[PDB]
Structure to design on (458 residues):
């Protein structure tokens, strides 16, 4: 019905930021013509959300839409990982999204880290959705202390979902991790049948309580 | 309304060094029959902070377990949490949330502040930020509606303020809808920048909660302040 595609000309910025040029493709492939609205937005660390392209309505009367849109990422924005999202909502309510990530001030293919303490938190089996009748999704957590000295860390997780829900996934834990050691666990969330349908962001936070620096890791699961 | 939830905090104002907040949680069954539900207490704060009220000494292995209340009866529990110094100064929302077995959601929220005054506008060092749902429209019909917001930035500094401003609506299905494009304003000392910007919720947008999120940046100091307001599409 609609196929959305997003390409970024570049994916890695230095700490001072820079310019990213986006190529947007929206294809109406089906037999019927289609009306939709679309826009381009960015999500980043520290609760940053910002627009790159305003809401525009399109009636494919179908064609193929190709648009280039760039945006500046200023130095003041936090170093870390950002997600650019081309979003389309069709007249019938169907939602289509094409996302791409860029990083600022950190390496694209490295684990997030707090000055030598690396944070490896993953959706263990890559389960991106669960049935409306319920399902369970396990996550792996590995905090590896690559420093010469000990790391004093705090860790927790919530599920930020529909209807303003913020569901606890992992209570606040505190660990003193020796040099060279790793804190490892697997933690799952059971999505009970009663939880509302929609998108949940599994939000993991790790803090070095000595430096006071905090790193967040966000992972999406949809309940159908 | 099967369930009635209530929350109170023992204090609503912390210094920048943080502190300890005790909460009183009340969940009453108003229905004529037994109700089964799950409930939890969570906190949302500045800089994208979200955290659960619970802290454990070792490894958290607990499940989110259901409770039940027979006709007329009530659950009263107390929960406390530490707000560490490292957490950003600003406004926090504590939310008691209840999900009944039937899928119905009930919430009771209270706010506290850390390192800022309780009854004062959000501010960037003398530049105050006053952003409001203009007519107090908290929801729109599933068939669509429009909600205007007032924006007033008062520069109480001695020199001019250089700011960047934008708004989005963070909604269901991972939507982040542009509301106000990124603009840069130069505001003289003593002046107020005022505008009105609204968002049209098209009929086609998904039902559920939208957080209208306004962000203001002092582009000289690099400091950023957010203001979040909720609109529900039925
Ligand atoms: Cl205290």
């Amino acid at each position: 019905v609609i196929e959305a595609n997003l390409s970024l000309n570049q994916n890695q910025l230095a700490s001072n930021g820079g310019y990213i040029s986006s190529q947007l493709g929206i294809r109406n492939e089906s037999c019927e013509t289609v009306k939709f609205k679309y826009w381009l937005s960015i999500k980043g660390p520290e609760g940053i959300y910002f627009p790159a392209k305003a809401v525009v309505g399109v009636d494919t009367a179908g064609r193929m839409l190709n648009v280039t849109r760039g945006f500046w990422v200023p130095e003041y924005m936090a170093d870390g990982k950002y997600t650019v999202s081309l979003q389309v909502v069709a007249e019938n309510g169907k939602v289509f999204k094409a996302n791409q990530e860029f990083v600022k001030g950190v390496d694209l293919n490295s684990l997030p880290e707090l000055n030598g303490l690396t944070i490896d938190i993953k959706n263990q089996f890559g389960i991106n959705s669960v049935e409306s009748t319920g399902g369970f999704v396990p996550f792996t957590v590995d905090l590896n202390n690559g420093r010469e000295g000990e790391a004093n860390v705090e860790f927790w997780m919530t599920a930020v979902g529909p209807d303003g829900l913020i569901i606890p996934v992992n209570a606040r834990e505190k660990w003193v991790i020796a040099s060279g050691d790793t804190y490892s666990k697997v933690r799952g969330i059971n999505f009970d049948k009663s939880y509302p349908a929609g998108e949940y962001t599994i939000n993991a936070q790790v803090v070095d309580i000595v430096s006071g620096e905090r790193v967040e890791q966000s992972m999406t699961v949809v309940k159908k």
